Amino acid sequence: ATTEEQKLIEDVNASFRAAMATTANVPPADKYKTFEAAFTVSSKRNLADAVSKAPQLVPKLDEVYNAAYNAADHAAPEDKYEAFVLHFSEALRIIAGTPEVHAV
Amino acid sequence: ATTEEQKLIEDVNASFRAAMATTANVPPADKYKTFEAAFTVSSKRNLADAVSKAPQLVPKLDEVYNAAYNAADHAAPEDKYEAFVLHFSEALRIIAGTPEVHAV
Amino acid sequence: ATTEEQKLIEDVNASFRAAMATTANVPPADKYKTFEAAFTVSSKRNLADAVSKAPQLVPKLDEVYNAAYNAADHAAPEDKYEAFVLHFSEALRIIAGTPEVHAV
Amino acid sequence: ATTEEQKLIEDVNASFRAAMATTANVPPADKYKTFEAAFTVSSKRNLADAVSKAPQLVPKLDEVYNAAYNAADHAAPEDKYEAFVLHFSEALRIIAGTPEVHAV
Amino acid sequence: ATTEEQKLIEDVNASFRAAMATTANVPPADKYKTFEAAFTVSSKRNLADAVSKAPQLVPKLDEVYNAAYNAADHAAPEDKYEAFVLHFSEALRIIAGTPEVHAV
Amino acid sequence: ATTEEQKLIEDVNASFRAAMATTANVPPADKYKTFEAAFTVSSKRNLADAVSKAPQLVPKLDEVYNAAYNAADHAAPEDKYEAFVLHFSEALRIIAGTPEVHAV
Amino acid sequence: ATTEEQKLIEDVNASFRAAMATTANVPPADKYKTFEAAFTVSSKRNLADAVSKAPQLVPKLDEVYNAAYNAADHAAPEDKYEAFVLHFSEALRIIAGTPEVHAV
Amino acid sequence: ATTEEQKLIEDVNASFRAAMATTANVPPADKYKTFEAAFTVSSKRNLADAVSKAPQLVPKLDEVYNAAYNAADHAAPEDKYEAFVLHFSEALRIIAGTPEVHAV
Amino acid sequence: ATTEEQKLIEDVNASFRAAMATTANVPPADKYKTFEAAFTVSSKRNLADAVSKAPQLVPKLDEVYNAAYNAADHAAPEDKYEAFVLHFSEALRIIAGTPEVHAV
Amino acid sequence: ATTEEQKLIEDVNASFRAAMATTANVPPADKYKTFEAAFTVSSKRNLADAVSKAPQLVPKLDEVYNAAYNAADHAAPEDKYEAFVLHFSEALRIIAGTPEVHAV
Amino acid sequence: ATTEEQKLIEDVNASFRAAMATTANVPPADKYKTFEAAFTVSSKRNLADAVSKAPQLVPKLDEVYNAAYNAADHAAPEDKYEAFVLHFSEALRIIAGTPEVHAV
Amino acid sequence: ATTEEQKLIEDVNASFRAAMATTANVPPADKYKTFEAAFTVSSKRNLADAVSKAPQLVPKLDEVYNAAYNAADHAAPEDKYEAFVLHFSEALRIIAGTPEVHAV
Amino acid sequence: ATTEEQKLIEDVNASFRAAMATTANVPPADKYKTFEAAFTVSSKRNLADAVSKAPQLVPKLDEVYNAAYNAADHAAPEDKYEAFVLHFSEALRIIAGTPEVHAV
Amino acid sequence: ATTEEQKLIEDVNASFRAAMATTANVPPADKYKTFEAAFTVSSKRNLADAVSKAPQLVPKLDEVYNAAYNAADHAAPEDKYEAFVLHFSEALRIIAGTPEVHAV
Ligand SMILES: [As]
Ligand SMILES: [As]
Ligand SMILES: [As]
Ligand SMILES: [As]
Ligand SMILES: [As]
Ligand SMILES: [As]
Ligand SMILES: [As]
Ligand SMILES: [Zn+2]
Ligand SMILES: [Zn+2]
Ligand SMILES: [Zn+2]
Ligand SMILES: [Zn+2]
Ligand SMILES: [Zn+2]
Ligand SMILES: [Zn+2]
Ligand SMILES: [Zn+2]
Ligand SMILES: [Zn+2]
Ligand SMILES: [Zn+2]
Ligand SMILES: [Zn+2]
Ligand SMILES: [Zn+2]
Ligand SMILES: [Zn+2]
Ligand SMILES: [Zn+2]
Ligand SMILES: [Zn+2]
Ligand SMILES: [Zn+2]
Ligand SMILES: [Zn+2]
Ligand SMILES: [Zn+2]
Ligand SMILES: [Zn+2]
Ligand SMILES: [Zn+2]
Ligand SMILES: [Zn+2]
Ligand SMILES: [Zn+2]
Ligand SMILES: [Zn+2]
Ligand SMILES: [Zn+2]
Ligand SMILES: [Zn+2]
Ligand SMILES: [Zn+2]
Ligand SMILES: [Zn+2]
Ligand SMILES: [Zn+2]
Ligand SMILES: [Zn+2]
C-alpha cells in the first residue's frame, strides 16, 4: 500500500546517498560526471520497482529526477553537482511529505 | 478530476504572486510580514476550495506551505522573505509536476 | 457522515499512542526521533483514510501535526518529545470537540 | 464565506486581548476573575455574530472557550489566569489553522 | 424556524435517554463511563444537525451539556452519573421552555 | 493489457496533434508558448490515465515528453516549436514500436 | 535484472560507435556502406546477448535498428550515413531513458 | 520449450489471416491500409507474448514483419497489399521450418 | 537436554529478528541505536532463560553477543548496524552448529 | 518481571541525571552539597518502587549508592562530586549488564 | 546455595590476582599482553565452575570481564593494564556486594 | 507476613552474634578483621532470605549494616570492632521495634 | 507518598534541634528537664501529622522516641540529656535511611 | 471506621490473653520472659493491622504497650510480670473507653 511508496523513497535516497559517496575522492572537474554515472544505474532499478509496487509514485519520482537534472543542466560546470544534490534532496523531501525541506 | 487539481494550483500561485506584489513598495525589513499577512488571507480560501473540489491536493498543499514557512522560520530576518518565496515557488512546481523547478 | 470523522480521530489517536509505545526502552536522547519515525508511518495511512472518508477533517488533522511538530521544533532536545506529545494530545482533543483538553 | 470566519477569529482575539488588558493593575489574586468578567461580556457578542455570519464556527468557538475555562478550573488559584490565557491562545490558533500554535 | 429547534431538542433528549439505557446492566461503578461513552457519540451528530438547521440552538446546547458535565466533574465518583443525568434533564427542559423542570 | 498501452499512445498523439492545431493561426513568436500551454493541460490527464491503466508506460511517456521539452529548451526561440514537435512525434513513434519513425 | 538491460545498451552503443569509426577514412559516398557492413556484424552478437540476458530489450532494440535503417533507406545517398547515425543515437537514448536525446 | 514457439507461430498466423479478412469487402485501393491497421493491433499482443514465453522467437518474428513491411514499402500502391501478404506468409513458413514455402 | 539449547537458540534468533524489524522505517544513522535498544531488552530475557534451562549455553551466548557488539563498536557509524547483524548472524550459526555460516 | 527491573533502572538514572543538573550553575565547592540533597529525595522514591515492584533489585541498588557515597566520602572536597558521579554511573551500568561501563 | 557464589567470587579474584603476579618483571609495554594471556586461561575454568555450581553468577561474571576488557580496549597502550585492573577490581566488588568499591 | 520479618531479624542477630564469637580468642588488633570476615559470609544468606521472604526488610537491613560499617570505618583501628558491634546491635534493635535500644 | 514521610522526618528533626537550642543557656542540673519539656510539646504535633499524612511512620517514630527516652531513663542525672540527644539523632537517622548514623 | 478500631482492640486483647496463657506452667523466675517473648510476636502483627486499618489507633496502642513495659521495667524481677499485666489491661480498658477500668 502506502508502505510500499515509503520504502521505495528510502531506497531512492539510499541510492542517491551512495552515488554521492562515489564522489568522495574525485576532483571537482569530474564529480558531477562520477556521481551522475553511479546514480543513473541504481535509479533505473528503483524506478522499475516503483512501476510494479507503487505506480502512482513513478511520476512523482520522475519529477524529482527532472528537478535535479534540469537544475544542474542550466548551472555552470563548477556548480552542477551541488545544484543537482540540493534540488534532488529537497524535491524528494517534498514528495515524501517531509515538513522541513531545507536544513538543520 | 485531475483538471480540478491543476486549476487549484493555478489559483494558489495567483494568490502567492498577488501577495508578493503587496510587498513592492515596502522597505525590505517589512516585506516578509507584509507578504505573510496578505498571503495568509487568500491561502485559506484556496485550501477550502481544495477540501471540497480536490481533497487529495490538500496534504500536498500543506507540504508546499510548510516548505516555505519552515525555510523562512529558520532564516535570518533579512533572508526570510526570499527564503519563503524561493521554496514556495519550487515546491509548488514540484507538486504541479512541472519539470523545470528552478529558473530561466 | 460525522461518524467517519469520529472514527478517524480514534485511529489517529491509536497510531499516536502506539508510536509513543515504541519509545518504551530507548534512552531519553533518542525517544523523540524514535517516536517521530514510528508516527510518520502510521500517520500517512490515517491521513489517506481521511482524504477519502472525511476530507473536511484533513486540514484540521494537518493542523494538529503542525502544532505538535512546531512545538518540538523550537524546544530544547531534552524537551522535544514531551513538547510534541503534550501539544498533539491537546490539539487533537480540540479538533475532536472534547471539552477537557488539558488533564485528569 | 471563509472570510467571515477569519474576521470573527480576529474579533474574538481582539475581545480576548482587551479583557487581558483589564487585568493590568489588579493584584495577582484577582486577575483571573477580573479578566473572566470582562471577557464574558465581549464573548457573547462575538458568539452571536458567529451564529449569524458563520455558524460552523460556533461549535469550534464553544470548544476553545471550554478548553480555556476547564484548564483554569482545575488549576491552583495562583495559576488559573495563566492557565486560561495559555490554553485559549493556543486553542484559538488551532481553530484558526495557524501552524505555529506555541510561541516565539 | 422554531420548529427545527423543537425537533432538535427531541433528538437530543432521545440520544440522552438512549445513552442512559446503555447503563442498564452495568454495575454502579461503571454506569457513568459507559453512559458517557455512548452519549458522546450521538451528541456530535445532534450538535452538527443544530449547526446547519438551527445555529442559535448550538450555544444553548453547549450550556446544557456543560451544566451536566461540570456537575459530574465536581461530584464524587459514586454520584457522577446521577449528577449528570439530573442536571442534564433539567437544563434541557429549561432550554426547551418546559415549565415543570423538576419532576412528577 | 498491452491494448491499454496502445490506446493510451493514441490518446497522447491525439492531445499532441490537437495542441499543434491551436498553433495554426499564431505567428512565430507565439507558436511555442501557445502550443506548450495547450499541451500541458491535456498531458496531465493522459499521464494520470497511464498511472492507473498502464504504469509501465509512464516512464516511457516521461521520456518522450523529456525528449521533446529538452530539445526545444536548447533551441533558439525561432526553432523551439519545430524542435519540440519533431522530437516528440519521433520519440512517440519509437516508444510505440513504429518502424518508420521519420517520414513519408 | 534491469542491470543487464543497461549493460546491453552500453554494448550496443559501443558496437555502434566502433562501426562509425570504420568510416573514419572512407570517402563520403562509401561511408554508409562501410559503416553498415561493420555494424551488421557486431549488432547480431549484441542482439543475441539480449535474447538470453534481457529479452524485453530485444523488441526495443529492433525498433532502434529499424528507426535508423528506415531513416537512411529513404534518404538521398549523400545523407544516408548521417540519417542513420542521427536517428540511431537518439532512438537508443530514448530506449535508454536518457532525458537529453538531442545534443550538446 | 519449443512448444511455446509453435503455438505463438499459430497465433501470429491467426492474427495475420484475420487481418487479411478485414480486407474482404473494401476496394483494392483500401485493402492495404485497412489490413495494416487491423494487423498492427494484434501483432503487438503476439510480440509481447513472445517476449515472455519464447524470447528467441522475437527477432525472427521481427524479421518476417520487416520482410513484409519492407516489401510493400517499395511496391506501387496497387501492389502493396499483395506484396505484404506474399512476403509475410512465406517468411513465416521459413521461420517455422515449413518445407513448402511457396504454394499448393 | 540438548533440546533446551536448540529451543533457546530459536528464541534468541527470534528476539534478534524482531529487534531488526524495529529498524524498519528509521533513517540509517538511527538504525543501529534503534536496533540496539530493542535488542537489549529481549536479550536479557533470553539470557535469563538460558541461565536456568541451559547454563552451558550462557557463555556461548555472551560470545556471539560480544562478537556483534565489538564488530559494530569498531565500525564507522554508517556501518555499525550492518557490522552487528552480519557478525551476530554468523556467530549464532556457528554456535548452533550450522554448516553454512555465510549465505545463499 | 525483568521488565520492572529495567524500568526502575531507567528511573534511577533519570533521578540521578536530574540531580546532576541541579549542579549546573553552582560554584564547584557547592556542587556536591547541592547534588547530594536533590538526589537523596528522588532516590527514596525509586528505592520504594523497587521494594514493591522488583525486590531483588534493592540490594543491587544499595550497592551502587554505597559505591558512590563511599567513593566521595573518602575524596577531597574538591573531588567529591566527580567521585560520586563517576562511580555511580559505572556501578549502575554494571548492575544493568551494560558491556561498555566506561565511556564514549 | 549463595555460598557457592561467594566461593566462586573468591576463585575469580584468586585467578585475577595470580595473573597480575605474572606481570611481575615484564616491561610495561608488555604488561597488559602478559596479564591478559595468563588471565584468559584461568578465567575459563572459573566460568565453567560457575556454569555448573552457580549459573546465575555467569552473566554477572561476563559483565565484570566485559567492563575490564572494554576499559582497556579504549585506553592508550601505556594505560591498558591499569585500566583493566582498576575496572575489574571495582566491578567484581560491586558484583560481590562489597560496599567500599574504591580503596583503602 | 510480619512474622517472616521477625524471624529474619532473629537470623541476622544470630549470624551477628556468631561472628562476634569468632573474635573470642584473636587479640584486639585483628578482632575487627576476623569478625568482619565471618559476618560477611552469613550476612549474604540472610539478605537473600529477606529478598524473597520479606523484601521491605531489605533496605532496613542495609541501613543497619551501613550504620555499623560506617561507624567502624571512621573509628581508630583500636575502636573499630567495638564501634561496629555497638552500632549494629542498637540499629538492629531499632529496626526490630525494640524499645530498650541501649542496655541493662 | 514516601515524600510525606521524608518531610515529616525533617519536621521532627527541626523540633528536636529547636528544643536542644532551648538548652543553650541552662546549666547541667536543669538541661534535661528543660529540653524534655520543650520537646514534648512539639513532638505531639509531629506525631499527629504523621497519623494522618503517613501512618506507617508512626510506629517508627514511637521507636526513635522510645530509644531516646529509655536511654536517658537509665542514665545518671548528669548524663540524661546527652544520652537522649545522642540516641535520638542516631535512631532518627536510622529511621530516615541515612547511611552515616554516627558523625563527622 | 470506628469498627475497625474496636476489632483491633479485641485482637490485641486476644494476643495478650494468649501470651499470658503461655505462662501457665513456667516457674515465677521465667514467667515474665516467657510472656514477653510470646506477646512481642503477636503484637507486631496487631500493630501492623492498625497501621493500615486504623492509624489513629496506633499511637494509643503504642501508649498502652509503653505503660505496661515501663511499669515492669521499674519493678523488682518478682513483680515484673504482674506489673505488666495489671497496667496493660487497665491501660487497654481506658483506650477502649471501658468505664470500669479496675475490677470485679
Ligand atoms: As533551493
Ligand atoms: As500547553
Ligand atoms: As438540582
Ligand atoms: As531528428
Ligand atoms: As564476515
Ligand atoms: As574508576
Ligand atoms: As551510641
Ligand atoms: Zn532546462
Ligand atoms: Zn533550500
Ligand atoms: Zn523548523
Ligand atoms: Zn533552486
Ligand atoms: Zn517554527
Ligand atoms: Zn495544557
Ligand atoms: Zn473539569
Ligand atoms: Zn504550548
Ligand atoms: Zn468545574
Ligand atoms: Zn444542582
Ligand atoms: Zn537540457
Ligand atoms: Zn528525423
Ligand atoms: Zn520505409
Ligand atoms: Zn534531434
Ligand atoms: Zn526499404
Ligand atoms: Zn520478393
Ligand atoms: Zn573492541
Ligand atoms: Zn568480520
Ligand atoms: Zn569508607
Ligand atoms: Zn572508569
Ligand atoms: Zn568498546
Ligand atoms: Zn574508583
Ligand atoms: Zn563514611
Ligand atoms: Zn547507646
Ligand atoms: Zn528502661
Ligand atoms: Zn554512635
Ligand atoms: Zn522507665
Ligand atoms: Zn500503677
Alpha-carbon distance of I76 to I84, in angstroms, equals 12
Give contacts of I34 with chain C, Cβ < 8 Å. 26, 30, 34, 37
Q: What is the E23 CA–ligand 3 centroid distance (Å)? A: 21
Using CB atoms, which chains have 3+ pairs under 8 A with F? A, B, G, H
Alpha-carbon distance of G38 to G24, in angstroms, equals 12
Alpha-carbon distance of L93 to L16, in angstroms, equals 13
Alpha-carbon distance of F6 to D54, in angstroms, equals 52
Alpha-carbon distance of C77 to C84, in angstroms, equals 11
Spatial contact of A69 and A81, defined as CB atoms under 8 Å apart: no
Q: Which residues, 6+ apart, have CB-to-CB distance to G77 below 8 Å? A: G29, G32
Q: What is the E74 CA–ligand 16 centroid distance (Å)? A: 6
Tally the residues of chain H.
104
Give contacts of J10 with chain C, Cβ < 8 Å. 27
Alpha-carbon distance of A12 to A62, in angstroms, equals 12
Dmax over CA atoms of chain K, in Å, equals 43
Alpha-carbon distance of A78 to D49, in angstroms, equals 61
Radius of gyration of chain A (CA): 14
Q: Which residue in J6, D16, F66 sits closest to I42, CA to CA? A: J6
The dihedral built from the CA positions of residue K3, K7, K8 and K13, taken in this order, carries a sign that is positive
Check CB contact under 8 Å for M1 and J45. Answer: yes
Pocket of ligand 6 (CB under 6 A): J 86; K 86
Spatial contact of N53 and N4, defined as CB atoms under 8 Å apart: yes
CA end-to-end distance (rounded Å), chain N: 31
CB atoms within 10 A of CB C43: 17
Number of alpha carbons in the 13 Å side-chain half-sphere of residue E68? 23
| Assigned C-alpha cell, E15 | 440520544
**E strands, C1-90, in order:** none
Helices and strands per DSSP (H, E), number in chain C: 4, 0
Q: In chain E, which residue's Cα lies nearest the Cα of D67?
A: E66
Alpha-carbon distance of A68 to A92, in angstroms, equals 10
Check CB contact under 8 Å for J44 and M99. Answer: no
Q: Does J100 touch chain I (CB under 8 A)?
A: yes
What SS3 state is found at A96?
helix
Q: Which helix (H) or strand (E) holds N16?
A: helix N2-22
Helix axes J57-73, J2-22, angle to 10 degrees: 30
Q: Which helix (H) or strand (E) holds E40?
A: helix E31-53
Amino acid at M25: N
For residue E28, what is the DSSP state? T
Check CB contact under 8 Å for H41 and F97. Answer: no
Amino acid at E68: A
Helix axes K77-96, K57-73, angle to 10 degrees: 160
For residue C30, what is the DSSP state? H
Give contacts of K70 with chain J, Cβ < 8 Å. 99-102
Check CB contact under 8 Å for I25 and A14. Answer: no
CB atoms within 10 A of CB K40: 11
Check CB contact under 8 Å for J100 and I73. Answer: yes
Q: Which residues, 6+ apart, have CB-to-CB distance to J13 below 8 Å? A: J92
What SS3 state is found at E98?
coil
Cα distances from I65 to residues C26, K44, K75, L73, in angstroms, run 19, 17, 22, 41
For J42, phi then psi, to 5°, come to -55, -30
Alpha-carbon distance of E91 to K5, in angstroms, equals 73
Alpha-carbon distance of C4 to H56, in angstroms, equals 56
Q: Which residue in N15, N91, N102 sits closest to N59, CA to CA? A: N91
Q: What is the C50 CA–ligand 31 centroid distance (Å)? A: 75
The dihedral built from the CA positions of residue C97, C101, D2 and D3, taken in this order, carries a sign that is positive
Alpha-carbon distance of B88 to B95, in angstroms, equals 10
Burial state string for B72-95 with b = 16 or more CB within 10 A and e = fewer than 16 = bbebeeeebbebbbbbbbbbbbbb
| Assigned C-alpha cell, G25 | 577514412
Spatial contact of C33 and E75, defined as CB atoms under 8 Å apart: no
For the CA atoms of C31, C35, C37, C43, the dihedral, rounded to the nearest 10 degrees, stands at -170
What SS3 state is found at A23?
coil
For residue C91, is it left (φ>0), alpha (ψ between -120 and 50) or beta?
alpha
Alpha-carbon distance of C39 to C11, in angstroms, equals 12
Q: Which helix (H) or strand (E) holds M17?
A: helix M2-22
Distance from CA of J10 to the nearest CA of I (A): 12
User: How many B×F Cβ pairs under 8 Å?
Assistant: 15
Check CB contact under 8 Å for G101 and F74. Answer: no
Give contacts of I40 with chain C, Cβ < 8 Å. 25
CB-closest option in D2, D99, D100 to B44: D2
Q: Which residues, 6+ apart, have CB-to-CB distance to E87 below 8 Å? A: E67, E68, E71, E72
Using CB atoms, which chains have 3+ pairs under 8 A with G? A, F, H
CB atoms within 10 A of CB A83: 21
Alpha-carbon distance of M82 to L102, in angstroms, equals 13
What's H62-91 look like in SS3?
Answer: HHHHHHHHHHHHCCCHHHHHHHHHHHHHHH
Q: What is the C8 CA–ligand 24 centroid distance (Å)? A: 50
Spatial contact of E90 and E101, defined as CB atoms under 8 Å apart: yes
Q: What is the K104 CA–ligand 26 centroid distance (Å)? A: 8
CB-closest option in C48, C66, C73 to A2: C48
Give contacts of D58 with chain E, Cβ < 8 Å. 51, 55, 58-59
Helices and strands per DSSP (H, E), number in chain I: 4, 0
Cα distances from E34 to residues B84, C96, E24, E38, in angstroms, run 50, 19, 10, 6
Alpha-carbon distance of D88 to C70, in angstroms, equals 18
Q: Which residue in M77, M76, M81, M74 sits closest to M36, CA to CA? A: M81
Distance from CA of B60 to the nearest CA of C (A): 10
Check CB contact under 8 Å for H41 and F2. Answer: no
Q: Which residues, 6+ apart, have CB-to-CB distance to I80 below 8 Å? A: I32, I72
Alpha-carbon distance of K92 to K16, in angstroms, equals 10
Q: Which helix (H) or strand (E) holds C9?
A: helix C2-22
Spatial contact of N8 and N84, defined as CB atoms under 8 Å apart: no
The dihedral built from the CA positions of residue C23, C25, C30 and C34, taken in this order, carries a sign that is negative
CB-closest option in A2, A99, A100 to C45: A2
Alpha-carbon distance of C24 to A23, in angstroms, equals 40
Alpha-carbon distance of M74 to N70, in angstroms, equals 12
List CB-based neighbours of ion ligand 26 within 5 Å: J 70; L 73
Q: Does A3 touch chain C (CB under 8 A)?
A: yes
| Assigned C-alpha cell, M5 | 514521610
CB-closest option in I44, I66, I73 to J97: I44
Check CB contact under 8 Å for L6 and N66. Answer: no
Q: In chain N, which among 63-82 make CB contacts under 8 A with chain M?
A: 66
Residue F10 CA, chain-centre distance (Å), reads 11
What's D5-70 look like in SS3?
Answer: HHHHHHHHHHHHHHHHHHCCCCCHHHHHHHHHHHHHHHHHHHHHHHHHHCCCHHHHHHHHHHHHHH
Using CB atoms, which chains have 3+ pairs under 8 A with K? I, J, L
Alpha-carbon distance of J39 to J47, in angstroms, equals 12
Q: In chain G, which residue's Cα lies nearest the Cα of F64?
A: G94
Cα distances from E8 to residues D56, D64, E58, E101, in angstroms, run 17, 24, 10, 18
Alpha-carbon distance of C30 to I33, in angstroms, equals 8
Alpha-carbon distance of A80 to A70, in angstroms, equals 10
Alpha-carbon distance of G66 to G74, in angstroms, equals 12
Spatial contact of D28 and D62, defined as CB atoms under 8 Å apart: no
Alpha-carbon distance of K51 to I58, in angstroms, equals 8
Amino acid at H35: F
User: How many F×H Cβ pairs under 8 Å?
Assistant: 15
Q: Which residue in M45, M35, M46 sits closest to M92, CA to CA? A: M46
Q: Which domains does chain I have, with CATH numbers?
A: 1-104 (1.20.120.320)
Check CB contact under 8 Å for L99 and N41. Answer: no
Tally the residues of chain C.
104
Q: In chain L, which residue's Cα lies nearest the Cα of N42?
A: L3
Preferred mutation among B63, B73, B94, B98 to probe A, highest tally of A CBs within 10 A: B94
Burial state string for F37-65 with b = 16 or more CB within 10 A and e = fewer than 16 = ebbeebbbebbbbbbeebbbbbbbbbbbb
Spatial contact of C53 and C37, defined as CB atoms under 8 Å apart: no
Spatial contact of L95 and L61, defined as CB atoms under 8 Å apart: yes
Residue A54 CA, chain-centre distance (Å), reads 17
Q: Which residue in I18, I6, I14, I102 sits closest to I60, CA to CA? A: I6
Give contacts of K2 with chain L, Cβ < 8 Å. 44-45, 48
Alpha-carbon distance of M58 to M50, in angstroms, equals 6
Alpha-carbon distance of E39 to E12, in angstroms, equals 10
Q: Does D103 touch chain B (CB under 8 A)?
A: no
Check CB contact under 8 Å for I45 and J2. Answer: yes
Give contacts of K99 with chain L, Cβ < 8 Å. 65-66, 69
| Assigned C-alpha cell, M67 | 530509644
Alpha-carbon distance of N102 to N104, in angstroms, equals 8
Check CB contact under 8 Å for C45 and A1. Answer: yes
Q: What is the M10 CA–ligand 31 centroid distance (Å)? A: 23
Give contacts of K51 with chain I, Cβ < 8 Å. 55-56, 58-59
For D21, phi then psi, to 5°, come to -60, -35
Q: What is the I95 CA–ligand 19 centroid distance (Å)? A: 67
Tally the residues of chain E.
104
Alpha-carbon distance of B72 to B87, in angstroms, equals 9
Cα distances from E9 to residues B7, D36, D56, E18, E53, in angstroms, run 43, 30, 19, 14, 12
Which structural technique was applied? Answer: X-ray
Amino acid at E34: T
User: CA geometry: angle at J66 spanning J65 and J68, to 5°?
Assistant: 65
- Please name the residue that has the C-alpha cell 505567428: F27
- Please name the residue that has the C-alpha cell 591478559: K36
Q: Which residues, 6+ apart, have CB-to-CB distance to D86 below 8 Å? A: D71
| Assigned C-alpha cell, L48 | 537473600
Alpha-carbon distance of D1 to B52, in angstroms, equals 14
Q: Which ligand is nearest to the CA of F93?
A: 19
